[PDB]
Write a protein that binds this ligand. Structure first.
Ligand SMILES: *NCCOP(=O)(O)OC[C@H]1O[C@H](O[C@@H]2[C@@H](OC[C@H]3O[C@H](O[C@H]4[C@H](O)[C@@H](N)[C@@H](O[C@@H]5[C@@H](O)[C@H](O)[C@@H](O)[C@@H](OC(=O)CCCCCCCCCCCCCCC)[C@H]5OP(=O)(O)OC[C@@H](COCCCCCCCCCCCCCCCCCC)OC(=O)CCC/C=C\C/C=C\C/C=C\C/C=C\CCCCC)O[C@@H]4CO)[C@@H](OP(=O)(O)OCCN)[C@@H](O)[C@@H]3O)O[C@H](COP(=O)(O)OCCN)[C@@H](O)[C@@H]2O)[C@@H](O)[C@@H](O)[C@@H]1O
Ligand code: 80T
Ligand code: LBN
Ligand code: 6OU
Ligand code: Y01
Ligand code: Y01
Ligand code: Y01
Ligand code: Y01
Ligand code: Y01
Lengths: 48, 45, 27, 36, 420, 40
């Protein structure tokens, strides 16, 4: 866009949008529900 | 006579080695394994 | 109304820790 | 079916059973006999 | 010997009578007696699947090694005869192994008596040939007539075969035979992964028998240890590669070893892994399964440190630890280390808490079927009752094994320093 | 909808499974090799 090539700029921007949306909205980001931090002592105290 | 003195030192040394093994394993294999198996994987960005 | 799942810290963790530590290690 | 209300208590109890063996074997392997 | 033949006849007759009884079907389906890796119905299912052109390892019912399927393809008939013969062979191997071990330990005792290495007055602790006369017979009798072993062989579980392999490993190790001990240890590791821990006790006993000091500076120790390790690894590699060719595929390695190491079934057992992983947060599943499978291999090294000069007791403790902390434990596995109790019954005077622990073990065993029936068929009980029974049973086992270990240590200390 | 004749013959004939001859030969060869290495 600084240089002046509008077609290449448009293609690059489209690829940027596609990649950013795929990265942000990946289902793999949400993997497990929250485990309470005030209940981990019940997980680590009894054995360790 | 000297049999008891030769054996008790060996038993104390063996107990020391057993305690060292327990602590050293429970640290060296204990903590890295916990961190690797309970972490949330995060590739570099 | 309802009940969420919460650990019984006083009831069981204390019991199952004082069944190990004073039985074996400290005394 | 399992209990569905016993994940913390089962963890505590099974870990305690394992720690029983751990502590007993640790004492037997580490400590040595002494008089009085 | 005549008493050994009489005991063998009595055991075979009892097993045959229970085979022809109406309780065979009841015993065959007990979760305490059979396991996902050892049930007979699963052997029959995996043999029937091969007739349909379906690989038996493509399903989730069959988890046995190719050697078992090859053995039971030819011997699908006479299965009860096969299992009775395996039990008798285990008894014979244990009998002769203990008989040779008694002579070896008496020679050692005579040596340190001649050298006057013991305390001035330990005559009560001194072992005599009269007290050791019937120890080999009692070893074979505590295994043949154990209710655990009788149930495990009437149910037609391959646990009996794996016990026979371990017993022959013990016999060959006690009678020199580094080659045969390595082959039998490789076969035992083939059926179940855990028996590989017995490598250290076997190596220690072989080194002691061959009179090689186990020292870091020593070179003969390193040479012999390398030969034994190479022999074991080669015998295991050859078995794996050979049994690959039975179905021309590697799918047996997952279905057996990944099953053993990852515990996918979660089916009730006398073990401690069934509920822990049924009632479990998926956040720490990998960490806790790693910890629990480390637990079995955890004690071999520290036990070798303390018990370097007592390898047979080390092997007995290791067998007990395997039977207790296995992923899929069985009363048949438990019965293998209770055959060693007559060997260590000279430690009785130093045994605390023997009556209570024996009573607890008996109570838990008798209470397994009752509470299992209440939970499953009656419906008036939960899985919590069975879980509590497993907890109490394993605690009793652990305390009994540690109690024998403590008695052994007490006897060694008294022999070295002086009994009052 | 129900071609019985084709359904029967689409799957090849079922033969009882037997262990490979090469496998049994190799197993027996290993067993006799160990037997001779033990007995001399
Ligand atoms: N609009 C408005 C609305 O409303 P509101 O307003 O809000 O309101 C309303 C509400 O409400 C509610 O609430 C809630 C609810 O809930 C509901 C629920 O449901 C369910 O749950 C349930 C369940 O089911 C059940 N099951 C139950 O369970 C339970 C649990 O949970 C709890 O937790 C508990 O209880 C448990 O338990 C426990 O925990 C226990 C533990 C603790 C303790 C431990 C112990 C310790 C130790 C011991 C001792 C020591 C040792 C030493 C000694 C010396 C449970 O219970 P169970 O289960 O029942 O059971 C118990 C147990 C079992 O059992 C056992 C027994 C055992 C057996 C035997 C033993 C052995 C013996 C041995 C022998 C002897 C020996 C001899 C020797 C001698 C000789 C001569 C010398 O379990 C267990 O675990 C146990 C444990 C074990 C331990 C141990 C072992 C044993 C033993 C040892 C000892 C001893 C022995 C030795 C020795 C001796 C001698 C020697 C000398 C030296 O739970 C629940 C109920 O509660 C669920 O759901 P489901 O539906 O199911 O599902 C869903 C999802 N899907 C949940 O979730 C829910 O939540 O409601 C309630 C009520 O209900 P019912 O129905 O009414 O009830 C029923 C009952 N059954 C309430 O409460 C709540 O709150 C809400 O939520 C809502 O709904 C609404 O809305
Ligand atoms: C050409 C190479 C061939 C390779 C193939 C061989 C395979 C060998 C594998 C296993 C051997 C099994 C025998 C074990 C017997 C142990 C009894 C013993 O301790 O006796 C000791 C003598 O020490 C030893 O020989 C043991 C050394 C074994 C190490 C091998 C590791 C690699 C093996 C790969 C496995 C491949 C197999 C595959 C198939 C399964 C002497 O005890 P004593 O009672 O007679 O006291 C007399 C005297 O006092 C001391 O005189 P010495 O000089 O001889 O002692 C030196 C040292 C001994 O300390 C140890 O016992 C450590 C070794 C434990 C055995 C491991 C088995 C594997 O003592 C010292 O002075 C040093 C002080 C501090 C050392 C230890 C402290 C902390 C412990 C461990 C380190 C912490 C880290 C965690 C542990 C992880 C290990 C890295
Ligand atoms: C069977 C034999 C087999 C043996 C095999 C052994 C193998 C295993 C051996 C050792 C594995 C060690 C696991 C536990 C280490 C730390 C766990 C922890 O506290 O997490 C805290 C929880 O917060 C709390 O609730 C703490 C309350 C009590 C803490 C218990 C103290 C134990 C510390 C010493 C125990 C022993 C260590 C050294 C001992 C000298 C905070 O952690 P977190 O951030 O919330 O958790 C997120 C996890 N990531 C993301 C950080 C990765
Ligand atoms: C059939 C389905 C369920 C059946 C459940 C039964 C299974 C139980 C099997 C094994 C449990 C045993 C665990 C502990 C074993 C102890 C080993 C042992 O031999 O220790 C011996 C000690 O023995 C004991 O103290 C235990 C005996 C006390 C309680 C047991 C007896 C009462 C129980 C009977 C109940 C059933 C009766 C029915 C008819 C028999 C040592 O003896 P020794 O050294 O030879 O003495 C001479 C000294 N120089
Ligand atoms: C041969 C005889 C001596 C056996 C010994 C008996 C013990 C095994 C009993 C006696 C008192 C009992 C305890 C009495 C009270 C409790 C509290 C109880 O916790 C609750 O109040 C329930 C909490 C919940 O439901 O989450 C858990 C069982 C426990 C520890 C019991 C466990 C079993 C005990 C130790
Ligand atoms: C193979 C090892 C590693 C584990 C299994 C133990 C074997 C050493 C035993 C257990 C069962 C035994 C078999 C039980 C029954 C028979 C049938 C017997 O012949 C018959 O009775 C056949 C009669 C007929 O077919 O008409 C020959 C010995 C044999 C194969 C036995 C050979 C030795 C076996 C395989
Ligand atoms: C016994 C000790 C001394 C190691 C011996 C190594 C090899 C004899 C074996 C052991 C594990 C085997 C591997 C286990 C698993 C697989 C995956 C398999 O691929 C699959 O079909 C996928 C199976 C799956 O992961 O579910 C191909 C063979 C391979 C590499 C095997 C190749 C042969 C290996 C390396
Ligand atoms: C005779 C002995 C010495 C063989 C030793 C080899 C085992 C230690 C290996 C061989 C095959 C492995 C298994 C192959 C496949 C799996 C499935 C895997 O679970 C998954 O499906 C996850 C796959 C992924 O993470 O991408 C967990 C590990 C496990 C059980 C592996 C555990 C380790 C095993 C049993
Ligand atoms: C094979 C011997 C000689 C080494 C000692 C074995 C154990 C001390 C550890 C070492 C690596 C562990 C394995 C590493 C990876 C896995 C995959 C893991 O796969 C899963 O996540 C599915 C099981 C579940 O998550 O519940 C199951 C446990 C397992 C087989 C572990 C079981 C316990 C193992 C075998």
């Amino acid at each position: 866009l600084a240089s002046g090539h509008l077609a290449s700029a448009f293609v690059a921007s489209q690829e940027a949008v596609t990649s950013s949306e795929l990265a942000f909205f990946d289902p793999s980001l949400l993997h497990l529900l929250y485990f309470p931090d005030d209940q981990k002592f019940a997980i680590y105290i009894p054995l360790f | 006579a000297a049999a008891g003195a030769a054996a008790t030192h060996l038993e104390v040394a063996r107990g020391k080695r057993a305690a060292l093994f327990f602590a050293a394993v429970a640290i060296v294999l204990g903590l890295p394994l916990w961190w690797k198996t309970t972490e949330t994987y995060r590739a570099s960005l | 109304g309802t009940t969420q799942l919460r650990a019984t810290a006083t009831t069981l963790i204390l019991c199952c820790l004082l069944i190990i530590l004073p039985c074996f290690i400290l005394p | 079916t399992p209990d569905f209300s016993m994940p913390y208590n089962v963890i505590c109890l099974t870990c305690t059973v394992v720690a029983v063996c751990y502590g007993s074997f640790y004492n037997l392997l580490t400590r040595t006999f002494h008089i009085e | 010997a005549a008493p050994l033949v009489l005991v063998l006849v009595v055991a075979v007759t009892v097993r045959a009578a229970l085979f022809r009884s109406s309780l065979a079907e009841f015993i065959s389906e007990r979760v305490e007696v059979v396991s996902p890796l050892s049930s007979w119905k699963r052997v029959v299912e995996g043999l029937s699947l091969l007739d349909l052109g379906v690989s038996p390892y493509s399903g989730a019912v069959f988890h046995e090694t190719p050697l078992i399927i090859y053995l039971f393809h030819f011997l699908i008939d006479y299965a009860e005869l096969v299992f009775m013969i395996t039990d008798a062979l285990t008894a014979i191997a244990l009998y002769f192994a203990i008989q040779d071990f008694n002579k070896v330990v008496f020679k050692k005792q005579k040596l340190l008596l001649e050298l006057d290495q013991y305390a001035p007055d330990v005559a009560e602790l001194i072992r005599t040939p009269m007290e050791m006369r019937y120890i080999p017979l009692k070893v074979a009798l505590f295994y043949l007539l154990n209710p655990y072993t009788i149930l495990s062989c009437v149910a037609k579980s391959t646990c009996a075969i794996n016990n026979t392999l371990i017993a022959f490993f013990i016999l060959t190790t006690i009678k020199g035979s580094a080659f045969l001990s390595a082959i039998f240890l490789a076969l035992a590791t083939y059926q179940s992964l855990y028996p590989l821990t017995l490598f250290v006790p076997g190596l220690l006993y072989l080194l002691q028998r061959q009179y090689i000091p186990v020292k870091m500076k020593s070179k003969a120790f390193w040479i012999f240890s390398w030969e034994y390790a190479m022999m074991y690894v080669g015998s295991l590699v050859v078995i794996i590669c050979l049994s690959f060719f039975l179905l021309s595929s590697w799918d047996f390695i997952p279905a057996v070893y990944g099953f053993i190491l990852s515990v996918p079934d979660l089916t009730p057992n006398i073990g401690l892994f069934w509920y822990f992983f049924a009632e479990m947060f998926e956040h720490f599943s990998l960490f806790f399964v790693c910890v629990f499978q480390i637990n079995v291999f955890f004690y071999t090294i520290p036990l070798a440190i303390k018990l370097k000069e007592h390898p047979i007791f080390f092997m007995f403790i290791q067998i007990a630890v395997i039977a207790i902390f296995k992923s899929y434990p069985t009363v048949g596995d438990v019965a293998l280390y209770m055959a060693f109790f007559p060997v260590w019954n000279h430690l009785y005077r130093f045994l605390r808490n023997i009556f209570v622990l024996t009573c607890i073990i008996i109570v838990c065993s008798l209470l397994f079927p009752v509470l299992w029936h209440l939970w499953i068929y009656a419906g008036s009980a939960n899985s919590n009752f069975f879980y509590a029974i497993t907890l109490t049973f394993n605690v009793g086992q652990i305390l009994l094994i540690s109690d024998y270990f403590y008695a052994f240590l007490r006897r060694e200390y008294y022999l070295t320093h002086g009994l009052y | 909808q129900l071609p019985v004749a084709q359904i029967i013959h689409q799957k090849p004939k079922l033969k009882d499974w037997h262990p490979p001859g090469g496998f049994i030969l190799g197993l027996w060869a290993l067993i006799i090799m160990v037997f001779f290495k033990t007995y001399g």
